[PDB]
């Protein structure tokens, strides 16, 4: 049978799901979480052969290795080895929608392994195989004999091989189907891959064994007392002499213990579970677990005879914490959480969907170092070690069933169909059975983007019955359905409603108070971090802090899903959708991360870090008020560093230990300060530093900062007179001005500064001209495609209005000689097909000091779409090593994404002034700049700028960063005004009105001089 085309068959001969087992035969090894000789890894070198369909696999393969097979590492995704292409499709299914069928051409991966089994494992007990992740369905044979079948790419499939193995050499044969009926429930927005991509292991358990165990922790009103209850079930030989002992340890100290024979309480007219027992341990003043202080105990579950023989022991880390929603709030240990979350897919640019310890650790450290305290398993159960790590390092986790049917029409077509209830049930039930004892999991989710079907209602209820300790959430069907304890919208905006029919996305503040609504609201996805984005992030955090029931959200998402490809020369480059021949595909939509695929941060990460700070500050005179947002810890590893600088020049600084209780406040009065007579703005910067290293950070890590303008002394100082007056020389074509070793040339036909000489060296490669456009950001383009234009997208509106192709028409160009200067005045109009879009009027005043003051006044037609920027640009002849500026930094920052930036004097290598987004766009801007130095030039004013070796035109025309080529000289874009970048979503215009350039008239001024 084609079991893979039948949602009624999701496995054959598969064992029951359960929490992590290791079958230790020594309790102290279980207590220590040391390795168990009864749990072996079969990871390593396997044999593999690719077939275009299951019908192409030859029968001999069951009995022996195929000579044409290759040896490959397992776990792996076979696309990563090049056998076939990975596919990047977002919502549309990668296969024709015709449930429950799949393509007859269905890539089949034939894996095999010859391995050893010691006779002792076969003398007694049971030997099972466990495949933690096989995508998407597979048949298993052992020594040529058929064992079983499994579906659900994201949970372990276990089979008993006791009767199939023999001492010594044994051979497995695993026929993995890329497509199966399971694929209809696996439509998440990620690369479509396949293979044995999680661990493979062999577990020996005794015949009489622990088959499942559940640990719960309940508390008294103030959490000073708890009862740990552990229900343990056994399989096998039930006899009066059996007992279960559960002991709880805090380090090497045993804090509690209980022993009991099997036989639970009477449950009904037929009696009780004679194969189960519940132990209850009282624990006084338990050390509570939270993401802030991940206190853990170790519970050891010993199955043994009453007279003392340990049969086997299992164990887990226990976190004493209670999760509950009360009065509309999600509370953890009685206090309301504020979720600083992020969605994280399991993605590696070289290994595909294969996860490894190092990578997970690296992600958890960076998450924590960036003030995240929570992660959502978008959109499936994760590799088992993830949970261990979030339990130990401390992150709150939303564990999510592997159910996504986004591409159906309507989206709940399968989820409302009872015939798909069984397949969906398994995805929910087996997840809970496996991950229910992990303290890090605080909320269960029913899956993602599958509409709202009666199957969801049924399953919501199942979990609520089986595990009352955690809320259940689910966004489908409008995010506030009867299948969710939490209003958990994706991309609902802070103030702006989006009233789509049936599944509107209300402003999050308005959503909480709709008639009859009382649940807490935590966005399952917000702040779509695709390319240059995170514009508006601060607006979310301000609302979250202000409204109790607004408890946070999970950013979409942590890491770009880019894959490495190699060029002719063998140099790696970041690839996205369609780069593997895959089509249809969704191009760069797979890259939405705060960090690049190699974990390098994108600039948005620092904005998230800042807004997600755990300390808030207020300044009043010289008193700094620090407020802690921690709920359970005191600031026992923190000091406050403060510094005052006058326009970047350090004046005074100090440090003060921070001692604030959770939710407490501390006042810190600063020293009498410098009141310098010298002009400039005084700026106070404070930073919270952690003096001691932690499990997740190095000594000196900075966890928070904030700045305030202090006193400002405006300059009233007159510049001395210049022993010199610039001279003007005219011709029909140009106005030339000379002053000392300097020269300026203004073209009378174009109306622009066409060249400048310092000494006798030319300084420009292209003239200085106004610029009203930008190489569009992913958020400017949204879903627009050549093939299917989205006229509402910003890029399309600019295109259709002619912004990118408008030509400057000269309206006026004059030159006048003043007392001590030459003044050039110009006016230009930009038109498109008869429409005047913008008018630029300027004056350039060159004085005897050699400075050139430029004043620009622009008019923008009120009926043209608001332009991306209002600025000047030019290609400088010079290429210099560094860029030094007095303004916001040091990282890239945009109008709606600049809270993290601090005003100071910064100095970086040129290359740092470019952000290598995989899909190129306008990037590297720095705002609020008062002075910029590059080579011999200095520009002063109040502007935003970018500077790099790549023109806006080049960036707009190139689809991949590795294809960009440094141009001659350096392109400088200096903006009086720049539009926000948006990001509430990446498929509809999202730039907030206050960040759109709609004033109609704009004024800016700069002084360009040397040094």
> 537 vs 589, which CB is nearer to Na ion?
589
Residues 130-147: b if buried by 16+ CB within 10 A, e if exposed: bbbbbbbbbbbbbbeeeb
Residues 681-700 within binding reach of its own copies (CB under 8 A): 681
Could you say which of 2, 6, 598, 966 contacts Mg ion (CB under 5 A)?
Answer: 6
Which listed range, 247-255, 461-469, 537-545, 740-748, lies at the site for Na ion (CB under 5 A)?
Answer: 537-545
> 189 vs 525, which CB is nearer to Na ion?
189
Tokens read off for 304 = 């043994």
880 binds, among Na ion, its own copies, Mg ion, none (CB under 5 to 8 A by kind): none
Q: What share of the chain is helix, strand, coil (3-state, %, to 5)?
A: 15, 40, 45
816 binds, among Na ion, its own copies, Mg ion, none (CB under 5 to 8 A by kind): its own copies
Rounded to 10 deg, the angle between the 537-546 and 604-611 helix axes is 10
Cβ partners under 8 Å of residue 447, min gap 6:
185, 379, 400, 401, 402, 403, 404, 424, 427, 428, 456, 474, 476
409 binds, among Mg ion, Na ion, its own copies, none (CB under 5 to 8 A by kind): none
163 binds, among its own copies, Na ion, Mg ion, none (CB under 5 to 8 A by kind): none
> 331 vs 827, which CB is nearer to its own copies?
827
275 binds, among Mg ion, Na ion, its own copies, none (CB under 5 to 8 A by kind): none
Assess 419 for contact with its own copies (CB under 8 A): no
Other CB atoms closer than 10 Å to residue 906's CB: what's the count?
Answer: 21
> 721 vs 786, which CB is nearer to its own copies?
721
Could you say which of 409, 716, 720, 721 contacts its own copies (CB under 8 A)?
Answer: 716
Assess 496 for contact with its own copies (CB under 8 A): no
Instruction: Catalogue the E-assigned strands of 319-469.
Output: 323-326, 329-332, 335-336, 339-343, 374-376, 396-400, 441-445
Q: How far is the CB of 915 from Na ion (least distance, A)?
A: 13
Residues 186-245 within binding reach of Mg ion (CB under 5 A): 189
> 393 vs 589, which CB is nearer to Na ion?
589
Q: H helices within 678-804, ranges in order? A: 778-781, 794-801
Residues 949-1008 within binding reach of Mg ion (CB under 5 A): none
Could you say which of 829, 910, 956, 966 contacts its own copies (CB under 8 A)?
Answer: 829
Assess 721 for contact with its own copies (CB under 8 A): no
Query: With contacts defined by CB under 8 A, how many residues of the chain interact with its own copies?
Result: 32
Burial class (CB in 10 A: 0-12, 13-18, 19+), 501: exposed
Residues 801-820 within binding reach of its own copies (CB under 8 A): 809, 811-812, 814, 816, 818-819
Q: How far is the CB of 999 from its own copies (least distance, A)?
A: 10
Could you say which of 168, 410, 584, 657 contacts Mg ion (CB under 5 A)?
Answer: 584
Q: How far is the CB of 980 from its own copies (least distance, A)?
A: 16
Tokens read off for 427 = 């995805």
Q: H helices within 600-750, ranges in order? A: 604-611
- The binding track of 438-477 with respect to Mg ion, each residue x by CB under 5 A or -, is -----------x----------------------------
Assess 777 for contact with Na ion (CB under 5 A): no
Query: With contacts defined by CB under 5 A, how many residues of the chain interact with Na ion?
Result: 11
Q: Supply angle C-alpha 206, 133, 115, rounded to 5.
A: 55
Q: Supply angle C-alpha 501, 507, 513, rounded to 5.
A: 95
Cβ partners under 8 Å of residue 342, min gap 6:
367, 372, 374, 375, 376, 554, 555, 557, 558, 594, 608
How far is Cα 797 from Cα 979, in angstroms, rounded to an integer?
14
Assess 732 for contact with its own copies (CB under 8 A): no
181 binds, among Mg ion, Na ion, its own copies, none (CB under 5 to 8 A by kind): Mg ion
Closest residue to Na ion, Cβ-based? Answer: 920
> 629 vs 859, which CB is nearer to its own copies?
859
Q: H helices within 533-603, ranges in order? A: 537-546
Closest residue to Mg ion, Cβ-based? Answer: 406
| Nearest residue to 110 via CA among 151, 147, 64, 156 | 64
Which listed range, 20-28, 513-521, 783-791, 997-1005, lies at the site for its own copies (CB under 8 A)?
Answer: 997-1005
Q: How far is the CB of 219 from its own copies (least distance, A)?
A: 44
Assess 314 for contact with Mg ion (CB under 5 A): no
Residues 924-943 within binding reach of its own copies (CB under 8 A): 942
Could you say which of 895, 920, 935, 980 contacts Na ion (CB under 5 A)?
Answer: 920
Q: Which helix (H) or strand (E) holds 574?
A: strand 572-575
Q: How far is the CB of 493 from its own copies (least distance, A)?
A: 19
According to DSSP, the β-strands at 472-473 and 441-445 are parallel
How far is Cα 813 from Cα 828, in angstroms, rounded to an integer?
9
> 117 vs 974, which CB is nearer to Mg ion?
117
- The binding track of 105-124 with respect to Mg ion, each residue x by CB under 5 A or -, is ------------------x-
Burial class (CB in 10 A: 0-12, 13-18, 19+), 732: exposed
449 binds, among its own copies, Mg ion, Na ion, none (CB under 5 to 8 A by kind): Mg ion
Which listed range, 9-17, 505-513, 853-861, 872-880, lies at the site for its own copies (CB under 8 A)?
Answer: 853-861
Assess 166 for contact with its own copies (CB under 8 A): no
Assess 720 for contact with its own copies (CB under 8 A): no
- CA 113 distance to own-chain centroid: 37
Cβ partners under 8 Å of residue 399, min gap 6:
377, 381, 382, 387, 431, 435, 438, 441, 443, 444, 445
370 binds, among its own copies, Na ion, Mg ion, none (CB under 5 to 8 A by kind): none
How far is Cα 643 from Cα 237, in angstroms, rounded to an integer?
72
Tokens read off for 250 = 């805090």
- The binding track of 546-565 with respect to Na ion, each residue x by CB under 5 A or -, is --x-x---------------
Assess 709 for contact with its own copies (CB under 8 A): yes
Residue with tokens 């907030």: 992
826 binds, among Na ion, its own copies, Mg ion, none (CB under 5 to 8 A by kind): none
Contact 551, 338 (CB under 8 A): yes
Q: How far is the CB of 874 from Na ion (least distance, A)?
A: 21
Assess 759 for contact with Mg ion (CB under 5 A): no
Rounded to 10 deg, the angle between the 421-435 and 454-466 helix axes is 30
Which residues on adjacent β-strands are paired with residue 789?
Answer: none
Assess 619 for contact with its own copies (CB under 8 A): no
Q: What is the dihedral of CA 838, 839, 845, 850, to 10 degrees?
A: 30
Q: Which helix (H) or strand (E) holds 133?
A: none
Other CB atoms closer than 10 Å to residue 843's CB: what's the count?
Answer: 16
Active-site residue list: 449, 525
Q: How far is the CB of 635 from its own copies (least distance, A)?
A: 24
Assess 589 for contact with Na ion (CB under 5 A): yes
| Nearest residue to 958 via CA among 986, 987, 925, 921 | 921
Assess 267 for contact with its own copies (CB under 8 A): no
According to DSSP, the β-strands at 615-620 and 649-657 are unpaired
**Rounded alpha-carbon distances, angstroms, from residue 262 to 208, 302, 306:** 12, 13, 11
Residues 618-637 within binding reach of Na ion (CB under 5 A): 635
123 binds, among its own copies, Na ion, Mg ion, none (CB under 5 to 8 A by kind): Mg ion
- Coil, strand or helix at 281: strand
Binding site for its own copies (CB under 8 A): 681, 709-714, 716, 718, 809, 811-812, 814, 816, 818-819, 823, 829, 831, 835-836, 839, 857, 859, 861-863, 942, 1000-1001, 1003, 1005
List residues binding Na ion (CB under 5 A): 189, 544, 548, 550, 589, 592, 635, 638, 657-658, 920
């Amino acid at each position: 049978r084609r079991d893979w085309e039948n949602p009624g068959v999701t496995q054959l001969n598969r064992l029951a799901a359960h929490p992590p087992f290791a079958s230790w035969r020594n309790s102290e090894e279980a207590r220590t979480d040391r390795p168990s000789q009864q749990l072996r890894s079969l990871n390593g070198e396997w044999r593999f052969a690719w077939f275009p369909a299951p019908e192409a696999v030859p029968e001999s393969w069951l009995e022996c290795d195929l000579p044409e097979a290759d040896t490959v590492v397992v776990p792996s995704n076979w696309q990563m080895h090049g056998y076939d292409a990975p596919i990047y499709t977002n919502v549309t299914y990668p296969i024709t929608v015709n449930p429950p069928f799949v393509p007859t051409e269905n890539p089949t991966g034939c894996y095999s392994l010859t391995f050893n089994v010691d006779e002792s494992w076969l003398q007694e007990g049971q030997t099972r195989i466990i495949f933690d992740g096989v995508n998407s369905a597979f048949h298993l044979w052992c020594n040529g004999r058929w064992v079983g079948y499994g579906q659900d790419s994201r949970l372990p499939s276990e089979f008993d091989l006791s009767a199939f193995l023999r001492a010594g050499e044994n051979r497995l044969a695993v026929m993995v189907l890329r497509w199966s009926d399971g694929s209809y429930l696996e439509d998440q927005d990620m690369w479509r891959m396949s293979g044995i991509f999680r661990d493979v292991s062999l577990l020996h358990k005794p015949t009489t064994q622990i088959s499942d165990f559940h640990v719960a922790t309940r508390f008294n009103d103030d959490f000073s007392r708890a009862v740990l209850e552990a229900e343990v079930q056994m399989c096998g030989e039930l006899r009066d002499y059996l007992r279960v002992t559960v002991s709880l340890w805090q380090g090497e100290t045993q804090v509690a213990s209980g022993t009991a024979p099997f036989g639970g309480e009477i449950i009904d007219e037929r009696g009780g579970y004679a194969d189960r027992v519940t132990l209850r341990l009282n624990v006084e003043n338990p050390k509570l677990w939270s993401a802030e202080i991940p206190n853990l105990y170790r519970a050891v579950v010993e199955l043994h005879t009453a007279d003392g023989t340990l049969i086997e022991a299992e164990a887990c880390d226990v976190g004493f914490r209670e999760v509950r929603i009360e009065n509309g709030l999600l509370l953890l240990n009685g206090k309301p959480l504020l979720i600083r979350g992020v969605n994280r897919h399991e993605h590696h640019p070289l290994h595909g969907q294969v996860m490894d310890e190092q990578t997970m650790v690296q992600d958890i450290l960076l998450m924590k170092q960036n003030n995240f305290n929570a992660v959502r398993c978008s959109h499936y159960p994760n590799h088992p070690l993830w949970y261990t790590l979030c339990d130990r390092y401390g992150l709150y986790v939303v564990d999510e069933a592997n159910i996504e049917t986004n591409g159906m029409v309507p989206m709940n077509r399968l989820t409302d169909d009872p015939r798909w209830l069984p397949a969906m049930s398994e995805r929910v039930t087996r997840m809970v059975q496996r991950d229910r004892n992990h303290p890090s999991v605080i909320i269960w989710s029913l899956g993602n983007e599958s509409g709202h079907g009666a199957n969801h209602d049924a399953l919501y209820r199942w979990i609520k019955s089986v595990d009352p300790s955690r809320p259940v959430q689910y966004e489908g069907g409008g995010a506030d359905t009867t299948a969710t304890d939490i209003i958990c919208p994706m991309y609902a905006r802070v103030d702006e409603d989006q009233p789509f029919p049936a599944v509107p996305k209300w402003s999050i503040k308005k959503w909480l108070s709709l008639p009859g609504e009382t649940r807490p609201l935590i966005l399952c996805e917000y702040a779509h971090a695709m390319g240059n984005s995170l514009g508006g992030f601060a607006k979310y955090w301000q609302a979250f802090r202000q409204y109790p029931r607004l408890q946070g959200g999970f950013v979409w998402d942590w890491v770009d899903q880019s894959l490495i490809k190699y060029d002719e020369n063998g140099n790696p480059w970041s690839a996205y959708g369609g780069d593997f021949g895959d089509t249809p595909n969704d191009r760069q939509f797979c890259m939405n991360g705060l960090v690049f695929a190699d974990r390098t941060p994108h600039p948005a990460l620092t904005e998230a870090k800042h807004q997600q700070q755990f300390f808030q500050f207020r300044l009043s005179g010289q008193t700094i008020e620090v407020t802690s947002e921690y709920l359970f810890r005191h600031s026992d590893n923190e000091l406050l560093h403060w510094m005052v600088a006058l326009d970047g020049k350090p004046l005074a600084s100090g440090e003060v230990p921070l001692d604030v209780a959770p939710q407490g406040k501390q006042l810190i009065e600063l020293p009498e300060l410098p009141q310098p007579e010298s002009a400039g703005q005084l700026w106070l910067t404070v930073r919270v530093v952690q003096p001691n290293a932690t499990a997740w950070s190095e000594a000196g890590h900075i966890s928070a900062w904030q700045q305030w303008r202090l006193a400002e002394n405006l300059s009233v100082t007159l510049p001395a007179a210049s022993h010199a007056i610039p001279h003007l020389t005219t011709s029909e074509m140009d106005f030339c001005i000379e002053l000392g070793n300097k020269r300026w040339q203004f073209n009378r036909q174009s109306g622009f500064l066409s060249q400048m000489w310092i000494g006798d060296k030319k300084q420009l490669l292209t003239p200085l001209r106004d610029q009203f456009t930008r190489a569009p950001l992913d958020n400017d383009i949204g879903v627009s495609e050549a093939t299917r234009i989205d006229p509402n997208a910003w890029v399309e509106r600019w295109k259709a209005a002619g912004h990118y192709q408008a030509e400057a028409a000269l309206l006026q160009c004059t030159a006048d000689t003043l007392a001590d200067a030459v003044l050039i005045t110009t006016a230009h109009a930009w038109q498109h097909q008869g429409k005047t879009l913008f008018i630029s009027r300027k004056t350039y005043r060159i004085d005897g000091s050699g400075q050139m003051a430029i004043t620009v006044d622009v008019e923008v037609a009120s009926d043209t779409p608001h332009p991306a920027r209002i600025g000047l640009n030019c290609q400088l002849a010079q290429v210099a090593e560094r860029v030094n500026w007095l303004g916001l930094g040091p990282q890239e920052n945009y109008p709606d994404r600049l809270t993290a930036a601090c005003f100071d004097r910064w100095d970086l290598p040129l290359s740092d002034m470019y952000t290598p987004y995989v899909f190129p766009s306008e990037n590297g801007l720095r705002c609020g700049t008062r002075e910029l130095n590059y080579g011999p030039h200095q520009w002063r004013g109040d502007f935003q700028f970018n500077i790099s070796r790549y023109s806006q035109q080049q960036l707009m025309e190139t689809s991949h960063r590795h294809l960009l080529h440094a141009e001659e000289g350096t392109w400088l874009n200096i903006d009086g005004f720049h539009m926000g970048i948006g990001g509430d979503d990446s498929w509809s215009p999202s730039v907030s009105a206050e960040f759109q350039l709609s004033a109609g008239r704009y004024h800016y001024q700069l002084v360009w001089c040397q040094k």
